[PDB]
Design a protein around this ligand. Structure first.
Ligand SMILES: [Zn+2]
Ligand SMILES: [Zn+2]
Ligand SMILES: [Zn+2]
Ligand SMILES: [Zn+2]
Lengths: 64, 64
C-alpha cells in the first residue's frame, strides 16, 4: 500500500514545533521552511541552524 | 488509484517554467515559491501574480 507513502509526505508538511499547522513560513536569511505562521512569529532564531532570524517570509508552495 | 496523487504532488514540486528542475526558491515580498534557482535568477517579475521580484530567497523544504 502507498497509504503510508502519502502519510510520510504529509507528515513532513507539518510545523516542526507546534506540530499542528502546516509549514508556510520561511526564516530569512537562512531560508529554513520548517514552521507555521504563528510559530515563526515567536522564534527569534532558526530551530535548525540557530541563525538569527532577520525577517520572516510567508511562502506559497503549490504542494498546497 | 494513487498514481494521480503522487504524480500531482511530485508535479507540484517541479519548476513552473523550465519544468525540469525542482522548485527551490521563492520571490520577495511576493511569496510564491514556484521556480528553481536558475529560473528565478532570470525573472524580474513573478509568473503567478506579476509583481516585481525584489529578492529571491533559497527555500530549504522538508520534502526536497
Ligand atoms: Zn507551529
Ligand atoms: Zn535556518
Ligand atoms: Zn526552472
Ligand atoms: Zn507572486
Amino acid at each position: 500500500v502507498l497509504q503510508e507513502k502519502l502519510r510520510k509526505l504529509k507528515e513532513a508538511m507539518l510545523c516542526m514545533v507546534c506540530c499542528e499547522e502546516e509549514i508556510n513560513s520561511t526564516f530569512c536569511p537562512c531560508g529554513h521552511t520548517v514552521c507555521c505562521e504563528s510559530c515563526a512569529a515567536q522564534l527569534q532564531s532558526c530551530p535548525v541552524c540557530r541563525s538569527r532570524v532577520e525577517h520572516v517570509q510567508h511562502v506559497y508552495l503549490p504542494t498546497h
